[PDB]
Amino acid sequence: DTICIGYHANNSTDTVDTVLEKNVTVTHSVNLLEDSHNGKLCRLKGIAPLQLGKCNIAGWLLGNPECDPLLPVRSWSYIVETPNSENGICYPGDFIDYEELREQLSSVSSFERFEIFPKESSWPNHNTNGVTAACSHEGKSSFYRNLLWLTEKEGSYPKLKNSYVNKKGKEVLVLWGIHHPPNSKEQQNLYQNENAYVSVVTSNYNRRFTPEIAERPKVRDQAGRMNYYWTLLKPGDTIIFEANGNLIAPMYAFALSRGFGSGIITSNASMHECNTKCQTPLGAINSSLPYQNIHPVTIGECPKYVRSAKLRMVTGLRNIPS
Amino acid sequence: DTICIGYHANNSTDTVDTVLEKNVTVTHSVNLLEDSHNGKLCRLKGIAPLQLGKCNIAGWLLGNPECDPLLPVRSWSYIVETPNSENGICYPGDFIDYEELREQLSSVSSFERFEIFPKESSWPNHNTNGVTAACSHEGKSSFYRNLLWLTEKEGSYPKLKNSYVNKKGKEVLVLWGIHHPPNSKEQQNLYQNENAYVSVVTSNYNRRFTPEIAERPKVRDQAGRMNYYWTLLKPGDTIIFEANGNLIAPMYAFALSRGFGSGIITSNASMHECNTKCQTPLGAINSSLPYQNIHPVTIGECPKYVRSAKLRMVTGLRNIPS
Amino acid sequence: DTICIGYHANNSTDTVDTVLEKNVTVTHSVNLLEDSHNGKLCRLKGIAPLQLGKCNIAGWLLGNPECDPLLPVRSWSYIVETPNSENGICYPGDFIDYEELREQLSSVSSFERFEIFPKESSWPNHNTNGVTAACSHEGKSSFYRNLLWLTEKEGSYPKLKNSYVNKKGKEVLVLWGIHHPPNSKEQQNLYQNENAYVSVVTSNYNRRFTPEIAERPKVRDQAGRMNYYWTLLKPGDTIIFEANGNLIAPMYAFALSRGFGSGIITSNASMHECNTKCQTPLGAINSSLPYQNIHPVTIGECPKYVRSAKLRMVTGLRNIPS
Amino acid sequence: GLFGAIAGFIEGGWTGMIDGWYGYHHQNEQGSGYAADQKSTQNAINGITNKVNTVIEKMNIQFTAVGKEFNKLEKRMENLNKKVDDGFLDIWTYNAELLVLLENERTLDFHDSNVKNLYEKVKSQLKNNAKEIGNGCFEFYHKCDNECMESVRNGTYDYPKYSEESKLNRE
Amino acid sequence: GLFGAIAGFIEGGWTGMIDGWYGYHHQNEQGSGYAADQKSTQNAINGITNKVNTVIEKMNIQFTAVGKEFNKLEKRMENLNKKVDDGFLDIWTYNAELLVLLENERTLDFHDSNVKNLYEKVKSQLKNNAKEIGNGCFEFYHKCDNECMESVRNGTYDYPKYSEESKLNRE
Amino acid sequence: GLFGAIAGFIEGGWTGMIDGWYGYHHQNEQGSGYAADQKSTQNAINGITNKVNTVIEKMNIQFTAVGKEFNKLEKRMENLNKKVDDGFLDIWTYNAELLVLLENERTLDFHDSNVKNLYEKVKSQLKNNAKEIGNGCFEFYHKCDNECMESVRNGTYDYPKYSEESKLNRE
Ligand SMILES: *[C@@H]1O[C@H](CO)[C@@H](O[C@@H]2O[C@H](CO)[C@@H](O[C@@H]3O[C@H](CO)[C@@H](O)[C@H](O)[C@@H]3O)[C@H](O)[C@H]2NC(C)=O)[C@H](O)[C@H]1NC(C)=O
Ligand SMILES: *[C@@H]1O[C@H](CO)[C@@H](O[C@@H]2O[C@H](CO)[C@@H](O[C@@H]3O[C@H](CO)[C@@H](O)[C@H](O)[C@@H]3O)[C@H](O)[C@H]2NC(C)=O)[C@H](O)[C@H]1NC(C)=O
Ligand SMILES: *[C@@H]1O[C@H](CO)[C@@H](O[C@@H]2O[C@H](CO)[C@@H](O[C@@H]3O[C@H](CO)[C@@H](O)[C@H](O)[C@@H]3O)[C@H](O)[C@H]2NC(C)=O)[C@H](O)[C@H]1NC(C)=O
Ligand SMILES: *[C@@H]1O[C@H](CO)[C@@H](O[C@@H]2O[C@H](CO)[C@@H](O)[C@H](O)[C@H]2NC(C)=O)[C@H](O)[C@H]1NC(C)=O
Ligand SMILES: *[C@@H]1O[C@H](CO)[C@@H](O[C@@H]2O[C@H](CO)[C@@H](O)[C@H](O)[C@H]2NC(C)=O)[C@H](O)[C@H]1NC(C)=O
Ligand SMILES: *[C@@H]1O[C@H](CO)[C@@H](O[C@@H]2O[C@H](CO)[C@@H](O)[C@H](O)[C@H]2NC(C)=O)[C@H](O)[C@H]1NC(C)=O
Ligand SMILES: O=C(c1ccc(Cl)cc1Cl)N1CCO[C@@H](c2ccccc2)C1
Ligand SMILES: O=C(c1ccc(Cl)cc1Cl)N1CCO[C@@H](c2ccccc2)C1
Ligand SMILES: O=C(c1ccc(Cl)cc1Cl)N1CCO[C@@H](c2ccccc2)C1
Ligand SMILES: *[C@@H]1O[C@H](CO)[C@@H](O)[C@H](O)[C@H]1NC(C)=O
Ligand SMILES: *[C@@H]1O[C@H](CO)[C@@H](O)[C@H](O)[C@H]1NC(C)=O
Ligand SMILES: *[C@@H]1O[C@H](CO)[C@@H](O)[C@H](O)[C@H]1NC(C)=O
Ligand SMILES: *[C@@H]1O[C@H](CO)[C@@H](O)[C@H](O)[C@H]1NC(C)=O
Ligand SMILES: *[C@@H]1O[C@H](CO)[C@@H](O)[C@H](O)[C@H]1NC(C)=O
Ligand SMILES: *[C@@H]1O[C@H](CO)[C@@H](O)[C@H](O)[C@H]1NC(C)=O
């Protein structure tokens, strides 16, 4: 009579690597590296993202007419920009602190688009019909939906001084613009004042703008420029504009709400009726594995991104079924 | 006759974790995680810290009257600010490069407060009694101890041009201010010049300041503003001020010395007659352990901060006293 | 008859450290820490570096006369500055965004020095012979090789407006300067206009410069200043200068090419006829070891820098030859 | 292996033992058969489950981490952010791969140790009532029925019960 | 354990052996008693002291490290500094916990190895002059007084001195 | 050692065995001599070569990494860049030194294990035809010529061929 001591073997072809040996066939193992995604843009914990479509951050906040208008009140879990965002800043100019504005929006979870300065009520004795061809819509010349080009009325540009008190209970993002004609003749024809100025003041913001006239190369068939500025009016604070020309006045501001875990991503995938706890620009990840080699840009509760192509931990024995 | 081979056991209840097993009772172990502190602010290697009390960095450097005046010459190992620093910038305005100034002070180990421009000697034909209610002291209106509000004297504000040569052998922090009235009437009543300017020049610093007049919301019952600027005059260099109005002139500068291992912390603990090699905002650490889970902000020679709740290394055997 | 089982021993004195024991004499081992270098500056993958000699980045780009002129077209793998670079900014002033310019040059692999504005063709009715003693050469007063000091001609400084179209197919670094006299008398004597201005515009760059006059401390026996500015004209874009005084006009621009793996280092070693895949400020590294304790600044394919003094991995047994 | 059992003096594994990692194969007059050792198998399962769960837990939840944008005059800050991201990625890839390799080596050694310990336990139970015929097997010097095989498998082998017969057959 | 001695064929520990980690318990006509083995105990103490000191030394002195402040227009730089701090903290917590776990496992295995090595040394010294009665014990086939016990404990056991008596009692 | 062979019951090494890490020394009427065991030596060489190559490969190629410059009003950014560089350097020095120490310990234990496995293999081959005279040696109870020594060294020892003579000499 005999008795033997042995160990398990099966038809497992799983291979793991050790420090002393590579490609060790084992009976049981566990994959720690997640490489699978659905290739879709899904909701993040029940909240759909904010898709800007043809627009980017600048074009959406300024109100580019070429982009489909969004609902007045929106809420999202993350922002999505398309790689070929052709509609953004339509009139040539510089967006001051645009990256800081994107970083601020990265923690925003909701906006309410309201009329801070009504068009036919806020700027008397001034023309509010100024449009341009660089911001065309349906072939015709147009202008931003959230801004208003104030020009001379009846050969006179009286000094305007308006203000808004923030009674929304939240931060109010306010955007405006400063125009710079290429020559002084256009300056007189548009604002009737060669020594014009703009002043924007709050309780913590204070800036003065002076037009700078010079011939500039044609960008979008425009020799003049238009610098865009923004600020975050705190709850209860008052913002005051005072100008005698060159002021691209605000018309629609944004009532913002702060959140956590949000961010801005550039994705090419489409939105589907799905939900996930982890979103990448390539697709959603439904996994509890610790690692993933899909994309370094992650939104939500995701595995740690690594460059590895294989992360498998052996749980069984050395498979020797011979 | 028999002889056996065995191992040690005791009444030790110490438990450690392994990769294969948790909560292993062992005979001997060593705790590597320091979780104990004295809850006091102590000296760091024999040098007491600099406690600003009711003031912050801005209020202490500008000379807010609400804070108890410090000794003329001081030396410290680290700076402490209270969480509820109500006394800082008392006249509404912007402190330009204030965070960079804090970062510069983070490596400073000593200061000597000296009178760079005497009050009754530096600014003839100008009034030096300007005070405000936003910087009140003992109920009465007052102003910064290190600055001087120059106004019009006898209906005229002559162009002042003064200078200081640094013969202190060290860097000299010099602070000044620029006032911005809300209207031009106050501008004429205070400085008699509507086109005023300020100029501050050294061998490496050069800046010009122009007043910007506009009605602004009331901050501390003040519609005007006061922007604060600073510079570090190098040894042997000369600083020159040239102004015809709106200049909040310097009166006391700081002779600074550079050191190592210092920093600025926000703490709620009190100063005690004690000494340590490691200081945290929660208290001092007297330990040689490699890790600590007390606070990530450390001053001096401290253990590495980790989020862990337990770091115990076994030195004995598996305790089996049965 | 007997047979024994044993292990290898030799006359090896190699010692390694373990977790349980230090200084273990072993039969075979491998050194992973590279500590050897040749102490020379060599080519990097067949491309020689760019040695600025007596000049730094600022002095080389502005065209300091004290430095030997380089060839019109140059290509390099990395930039070398000497620790005692005495020739740089010779006329006292501020180099705006100089560190960003260095960071831009860090990815440049080639330059072509061409005449963007010919001296005797670009600025009519203006004097182009302005020199200074702060930028002396061979004892005589001189000026930058790449800039031109435009002054008044025949008692009049007409408004100049010139431009350059980039047809080089690459980025064009263009540098210019703005002069600030200490008094208005010199301003009138040099530019005949007290209210002068400069304007530099491209398709993405737009800046206006106004002279600021004030008495300043003597730096290199000069009370005035000269601020230096730069821009990167994109291929196909046009740069336009428009000034009525104080414009230190450009004369030579740089046609730049982009590359990878380059950088700027400060070294004291000399250039030798040698080639390497790894370059440090102390010398070249010819090794395949994973680590090195030579220098943290590396150019090319180098081992990872560590502070360790010894990194030896045992491959043999515990050497017991007794 | 590190303990010389798996792929050592026990050359191969048993595909017929599907109930556990370690066990026995017996052969007597009543027949032959496999039987997994549930104690050592369960202890190994517990240890390796704890190891895997520990490796998974030590990696915290990666929350939202996106890229940032910088204008043309912020190249230094852009390169600094890129250096931070690349260094963190290098460190984490290094840690993950190294930990996986180390734990794989240790798990193989752990299985080897368990097999060797089971064999040595059976050997110390059997003593000279059975001879080591190699390949991790024992040939009894006495008749060992299913009851005796079960007393061997659960650690209650009666040595004096078969000592006389084993000494007689050993001669 | 990894070597099957601690919590293995030696079931429990000895509270009566206070002088060291490993040792012996003897019983003869002169009486019984414990005695720690000072050589293996001292070597283990040296090794574990070196291990602990190494783990402590590899962590350099954490010098002054405080937070920084940023204005409302420097949110990107603030988030970059926060990301740097959080990544370093994650990495260091991970390293500390992982190293502690690995070294604890290795220390337990080291003690197991030391106990097994001591037992095997005693066994190879005794040879067939004593029988393995399990539980890490040996029953002598001869009279072993305190001098013989000491010659066993220090590695100078005289096998031919008791070979004849052990063969007679072994029969 | 962890397995008690190197610097254990085999006290020292053999300088006369230059052909490998592990082997044998034989002595019979035909003479004496060393002979390295090529199988275990080659397997150890493969394993340690893989270990060294793995440690070298896990460290990626360090590409260009130079310092940056900052003006007098960018002290926070300068300190942030310095903190990033110093933290990465600390982490990498820590990882390198710790990995070297761990792998050195494991390599010593691996050699110990290989030596012990070779000794146990020879012992299980020889059985009672030879006696363990300690120091990792076996004294045969029969005449073992060079052919018998070679059959011992390559794992084809014929036990019944010398069983009768070994039993006669063992008496
Ligand atoms: C990792 O290990 C596995 C298993 O050892 C390797 O898979 C095997 O690769 C060999 C080639 O080296 C295959 O062998 C060939 O098989 C055919 C079958 O008809 C035979 O005709 C040839 O003469 C030759 O023997 C083997 O089939 C294959 N087995 C499996 C299950 O895939 C694998 O290649 C190793 N990977 C690496 C990267 O080393
Ligand atoms: C880590 O291990 C220790 C020791 O094994 C655990 O402590 C023990 O916990 C058990 C409960 O699981 C306690 O048992 C109870 O004891 C009372 C005493 O009268 C008895 O009446 C109950 O029937 C039950 O057996 C045990 O006393 C306690 N011992 C000590 C020394 O604390 C500990 O809970 C473990 N920790 C974790 C997190 O697993
Ligand atoms: C690491 O280990 C090596 C080898 O054990 C150490 O080297 C040795 O150091 C000892 C001193 O502790 C030297 O001993 C002296 O040797 C002279 C020779 O004439 C003798 O006269 C003295 O009485 C004393 O024994 C020994 O020669 C030397 N051997 C070698 C090969 O260097 C080394 O010091 C150790 N390093 C550390 C940091 O512990
Ligand atoms: C180990 O196996 C043996 C079988 O060989 C078990 O012993 C017998 O147990 C059954 C049921 O309890 C009794 O009917 C027999 O009379 C027992 N035989 C002898 C010879 O005692 C034993 O109980 C098992 N041990 C454990 C812990 O399960
Ligand atoms: C190990 O223990 C033995 C005791 O059994 C020691 O031997 C004896 O040593 C004493 C003192 O040196 C003598 O008086 C006895 O005559 C010795 N007895 C025999 C039988 O020789 C021995 O010295 C110890 N070994 C070591 C290294 O300490
Ligand atoms: C192991 O060594 C033995 C020598 O002891 C080898 O056996 C002999 O092989 C030679 C050549 O094949 C023959 O001429 C002898 O007649 C053999 N002797 C016996 C007793 O069979 C054996 O081949 C070796 N094994 C391996 C795998 O190399
Ligand atoms: O490998 C595993 C495993 C997988 C994942 C984890 Cl987290 C832990 C483990 Cl232990 N197993 C789980 C239990 O079953 C074991 C088995 C052994 C022999 C025969 C059949 C099944 C195999
Ligand atoms: O665990 C330790 C220890 C603690 C800290 C360090 Cl840094 C190193 C070590 Cl080795 N010990 C120190 C020496 O005494 C040992 C002992 C063993 C058995 C009985 C009584 C005491 C126990
Ligand atoms: O240590 C090594 C070694 C070095 C570097 C690497 Cl990457 C791998 C290894 Cl294995 N050796 C290489 C082969 O030869 C071995 C030897 C053993 C005994 C006697 C003479 C030579 C010794
Ligand atoms: C492999 O094993 C699995 C699980 O027992 C079984 O379902 C499958 O049919 C097997 N395949 C082969 C080819 O053996
Ligand atoms: C996600 O994966 C789990 C298993 O890991 C599965 O049960 C579930 O259906 C998947 N989908 C969703 C939406 O959870
Ligand atoms: C535990 O052991 C210590 C040290 O020997 C002793 O002082 C203490 O009294 C013991 N306590 C108990 C409850 O055994
Ligand atoms: C600090 O701790 C040590 C022991 O670690 C102790 O001796 C000392 O009294 C404590 N206090 C001071 C001030 O060192
Ligand atoms: C040491 O060994 C090497 C290699 O065998 C040999 O060349 C050298 O002469 C030896 N030196 C001594 C002093 O033994
Ligand atoms: C560099 O080192 C290698 C060996 O590592 C050597 O063959 C070569 O000659 C050295 N020099 C060059 C220029 O490669």
Nearest alpha carbon to residue C61 among C111, C109, C7, C11? C111
What amino acid occupies position C76? W
- Least CB-CB distance to A99: which of D1, D71, D111? D71
Instruction: Output the six-digit token pair for B114.
Output: 């000296």
Specify which residues A80 forms β-bridges with. A51, A265
Method: X-ray
User: C19 and E110 in contact by Cβ < 8 A?
Assistant: no
Q: Which residue is associated with the tokens 């970083």?
A: A103
- Ligand 7 pocket, residue D52 CB under 6 Å: yes
Chains with 3+ CB–CB pairs under 8 A to D are A, B, C, E, F
For residues D5 and D136, the answer to whether their CB atoms sit within 8 Å is yes
Residues 6+ apart with CB under 8 A from C148: C117, C119, C123, C128, C130, C248, C249, C250, C251
What is the C-alpha to C-alpha distance for residues D15 and C318, in angstroms, rounded to an integer? 40
Q: Which residue of A has its CA nearest to C210?
A: A212
Cα radius of gyration rounded to whole Å, chain A: 29
What amino acid occupies position C242? E
Residues 6+ apart with CB under 8 A from D35: D17, D19, D23, D24, D25, D26, D153
Cα radius of gyration rounded to whole Å, chain F: 27
What amino acid occupies position F4? G
For residues A16 and A301, the answer to whether their CB atoms sit within 8 Å is no
Displacement of CA D102 from its chain's centroid (Å): 15
Identify which of A27, A315, A319 to mutate to test ligand 7's pocket (most ligand atoms within 8 A of the CB): A315
For residues D103 and B19, the answer to whether their CB atoms sit within 8 Å is yes
- Sort strands B160-165 and B238-243 into parallel, antiparallel or unpaired: antiparallel
- Looking from the CA of residue A22, the nearest atom of ligand 1 is 39
What amino acid occupies position C257? S
For residues E108 and E134, the answer to whether their CB atoms sit within 8 Å is no
What is the C-alpha to C-alpha distance for residues D83 and F80, in angstroms, rounded to an integer? 12
What are the C-alpha distances in Å from C189 to residues C134, C148, C185, C186?
19, 18, 6, 5
- Sort strands B132-137 and B140-142 into parallel, antiparallel or unpaired: antiparallel
- Least CB-CB distance to A17: which of D55, D65, D104? D104
What is the C-alpha to C-alpha distance for residues A235 and A166, in angstroms, rounded to an integer? 5
What is the C-alpha to C-alpha distance for residues B262 and E66, in angstroms, rounded to an integer? 9
User: B242 and C216 in contact by Cβ < 8 A?
Assistant: no
Q: Which residue is associated with the tokens 């100029």?
A: B199
Instruction: Output the six-digit token pair for C140.
Output: 């005589």
A11 CA → ligand 10 middle, Å? 6
Domains with residue ranges and CATH for chain E: 23-170 (3.90.20.10)
What is the C-alpha to C-alpha distance for residues C69 and D93, in angstroms, rounded to an integer? 48
Closest ligand to B25 CA? 2
Nearest alpha carbon to residue D153 among D121, D111, D129? D121
Q: Chain A within 8 Å of C234 (Cβ-Cβ)?
A: no
Residues 6+ apart with CB under 8 A from C185: none
Sheet containing B206-209: which strands, arranged edge to edge? B160-165, B238-243, B198-201, B206-209
What is the C-alpha to C-alpha distance for residues D99 and A16, in angstroms, rounded to an integer? 13
What is the C-alpha to C-alpha distance for residues E145 and E128, in angstroms, rounded to an integer? 18
Reduced to 3 states (helix: H, G, I; strand: E, B; else coil), residue B299 is strand
What is the C-alpha to C-alpha distance for residues B252 and B273, in angstroms, rounded to an integer? 32
Instruction: Output the six-digit token pair for C199.
Output: 């304007």
Residues 6+ apart with CB under 8 A from E57: none
Nearest alpha carbon to residue B134 among B76, B72, B92, B77? B92
For residues B73 and B97, the answer to whether their CB atoms sit within 8 Å is no
Q: How many CA atoms lie within 13 A of F115 on its CB side?
A: 34
What is the C-alpha to C-alpha distance for residues E44 and E21, in angstroms, rounded to an integer? 8
What is the C-alpha to C-alpha distance for residues F59 and D84, in angstroms, rounded to an integer? 17
What is the C-alpha to C-alpha distance for residues D171 and E4, in angstroms, rounded to an integer? 33
- Ligand 6 pocket, residue F147 CB under 6 Å: yes
**Other CB atoms closer than 10 Å to residue B25's CB: what's the count?**
15
User: A232 and E72 in contact by Cβ < 8 A?
Assistant: yes
Residues 6+ apart with CB under 8 A from A315: A26, A28, A29, A30, D48, D52, D107
Nearest residue (by CA) to ligand 4, atom 17, is D147
Nearest residue (by CA) to ligand 1, atom 28, is A13
For residues F86 and F80, the answer to whether their CB atoms sit within 8 Å is no
Reduced to 3 states (helix: H, G, I; strand: E, B; else coil), residue E163 is helix
What amino acid occupies position A174? V
What is the C-alpha to C-alpha distance for residues C150 and C139, in angstroms, rounded to an integer? 22
What is the C-alpha to C-alpha distance for residues B81 and C186, in angstroms, rounded to an integer? 50
The helix (H) or strand (E) run that includes residue B227 is: strand B225-233
What amino acid occupies position B301? E
What amino acid occupies position E144? C
Q: Which residue is associated with the tokens 């939840």?
A: D61
What is the C-alpha to C-alpha distance for residues D134 and F159, in angstroms, rounded to an integer? 12
Instruction: Output the six-digit token pair for E85.
Output: 């701090």
Specify which residues C137 forms β-bridges with. C140
Nearest alpha carbon to residue A30 among A316, A317, A318? A316
Question: What's E157's DSSP letter?
Answer: -
User: D72 and C204 in contact by Cβ < 8 A?
Assistant: yes
**Other CB atoms closer than 10 Å to residue D121's CB: what's the count?**
18
Q: How many CA atoms lie within 13 A of F81 on its CB side?
A: 16
Nearest alpha carbon to residue E26 among E159, E143, E129? E143
- Ligand 1 pocket, residue A257 CB under 6 Å: no
For residues C276 and C179, the answer to whether their CB atoms sit within 8 Å is no
The helix (H) or strand (E) run that includes residue E29 is: none
Backbone angles phi, psi at E103, to 5 degrees: -70, -30
Residues 6+ apart with CB under 8 A from A178: A198, A209, A211, A226, A227, A229, A246, A247, A248
The helix (H) or strand (E) run that includes residue C188 is: helix C184-191
User: B20 and D51 in contact by Cβ < 8 A?
Assistant: yes
User: Which residues in chain E have their CB less than 8 angstroms from residue C19's CB?
Assistant: 50-51, 54, 103, 106
Specify which residues C113 forms β-bridges with. C254
- Ligand 6 pocket, residue F154 CB under 6 Å: yes
Specify which residues A161 forms β-bridges with. A242
Instruction: Output the six-digit token pair for B73.
Output: 């010459």
What is the C-alpha to C-alpha distance for residues C278 and B120, in angstroms, rounded to an integer? 65
Reduced to 3 states (helix: H, G, I; strand: E, B; else coil), residue E23 is strand
Specify which residues B153 forms β-bridges with. B156
User: B103 and F75 in contact by Cβ < 8 A?
Assistant: yes
Nearest alpha carbon to residue C91 among C72, C65, C67, C73? C65
Q: Which residue is associated with the tokens 């604890």?
A: E104
Residues 6+ apart with CB under 8 A from D1: A318, D7, D8, D108, D109, D112
For residues C231 and C104, the answer to whether their CB atoms sit within 8 Å is no
What are the C-alpha distances in Å from A137 to residues A32, A132, A249, F154?
52, 10, 20, 89
Instruction: Output the six-digit token pair for F60.
Output: 């990626």
Torsional class of F134: left (φ above 0), alpha (ψ -120 to 50), beta (otherwise): left
Q: Which residue of C has its CA nearest to A226?
A: C206
- Sort strands C252-258 and C171-180 into parallel, antiparallel or unpaired: antiparallel
Report resolution (Å) to 1 decimal: 2.7
**Other CB atoms closer than 10 Å to residue B162's CB: what's the count?**
17
Torsion of CA B35, B41, B47, B52, to 10 degrees: 140
Q: Tell me how many residue pairs between chain B and chain E have CB atoms under 8 A apart.
A: 211
Reduced to 3 states (helix: H, G, I; strand: E, B; else coil), residue A316 is coil
Specify which residues C230 forms β-bridges with. C175
The helix (H) or strand (E) run that includes residue E59 is: none
- Looking from the CA of residue D52, the nearest atom of ligand 7 is 7
What is the C-alpha to C-alpha distance for residues E93 and B292, in angstroms, rounded to an integer? 10
Specify which residues B41 forms β-bridges with. B271
C11 CA → ligand 14 middle, Å? 6
For residues A103 and A287, the answer to whether their CB atoms sit within 8 Å is no
What is the C-alpha to C-alpha distance for residues A157 and A151, in angstroms, rounded to an integer? 7
Closest ligand to B17 CA? 2
User: D83 and F80 in contact by Cβ < 8 A?
Assistant: no
Q: Which residue of E has its CA nearest to F10?
A: E121
Residues with CB under 6 A from ligand 9: C 8, 28, 30, 315-316; F 18, 20-21, 45, 48-49, 52
Nearest alpha carbon to residue C52 among C220, C265, C272? C265
Q: Chain A within 8 Å of F50 (Cβ-Cβ)?
A: yes
Displacement of CA B252 from its chain's centroid (Å): 18
Counting Cβ atoms within 10 Å, is residue B93 exposed (0-12), middle (13-18) or buried (19+)? buried
Q: How far away is chain F from the Cα of C106, in angstroms, using its nearest Cα?
A: 9
Q: How far away is chain A from the Cα of D30, in angstroms, using its nearest Cα?
A: 10
Reduced to 3 states (helix: H, G, I; strand: E, B; else coil), residue C293 is coil
Q: Tell me how many residue pairs between chain B and chain D have CB atoms under 8 A apart.
A: 14
- Least CB-CB distance to C208: which of A94, A212, A219? A212
Q: Chain A within 8 Å of F103 (Cβ-Cβ)?
A: yes
- Ligand 1 pocket, residue A23 CB under 6 Å: yes
What is the C-alpha to C-alpha distance for residues F94 and E57, in angstroms, rounded to an integer? 10
What is the C-alpha to C-alpha distance for residues A226 and A229, in angstroms, rounded to an integer? 10
For residues F85 and C296, the answer to whether their CB atoms sit within 8 Å is yes
Residues E62-94: b if buried by 16+ CB within 10 A, e if exposed: bebbbebebeeebbbbbbbbebbbebbebbbbb
CA angle C56, C59, C63 (to 5 degrees): 140
What are the C-alpha distances in Å from B134 to residues A187, A204, B64, C43, F118?
42, 16, 11, 66, 90
Residue among B198, B202, B206, B210 with most chain C CBs within 10 A, to mutate: B206
Specify which residues A250 forms β-bridges with. A147
Backbone angles phi, psi at A76, to 5 degrees: -150, 170
**Considering Cα of C290, then F69, then A95, then A183, what sign does the dihedral take?**
negative
Q: How far away is chain A from the Cα of C314, in angstroms, using its nearest Cα?
A: 14
Instruction: Output the six-digit token pair for B128.
Output: 């030096």
What amino acid occupies position B216? R
Orientation angle between helical segments F38-58 and D75-126, nearest 10 degrees: 150
CA angle E146, E7, F11 (to 5 degrees): 55
What is the C-alpha to C-alpha distance for residues C116 and C172, in angstroms, rounded to an integer? 10
User: E75 and A204 in contact by Cβ < 8 A?
Assistant: no
Residues 6+ apart with CB under 8 A from B170: B235, B255, B256, B257
- Looking from the CA of residue D48, the nearest atom of ligand 7 is 10
Q: Chain C within 8 Å of E51 (Cβ-Cβ)?
A: yes
User: D11 and A320 in contact by Cβ < 8 A?
Assistant: yes
Chains with 3+ CB–CB pairs under 8 A to A are B, C, D, E, F
DSSP assignment of chain D: --SSTBTTTB-S-BTT--S-SEEEEEEETTEEEEEE-HHHHHHHHHHHHHHHHHHHHHS--B--B------TT-HHHHHHHHHHHHHHHHHHHHHHHHHHHHHHHHHHHHHHHHHHHHHHHHHHHHGGGEEE-STTEEEESS---HHHHHHHHTT---HHHHHHHHHHHH-
- Sort strands B225-233 and B171-180 into parallel, antiparallel or unpaired: antiparallel
- Ligand 6 pocket, residue F145 CB under 6 Å: no
For residues B198 and B243, the answer to whether their CB atoms sit within 8 Å is yes
Q: Which residue is associated with the tokens 């130079």?
A: F66
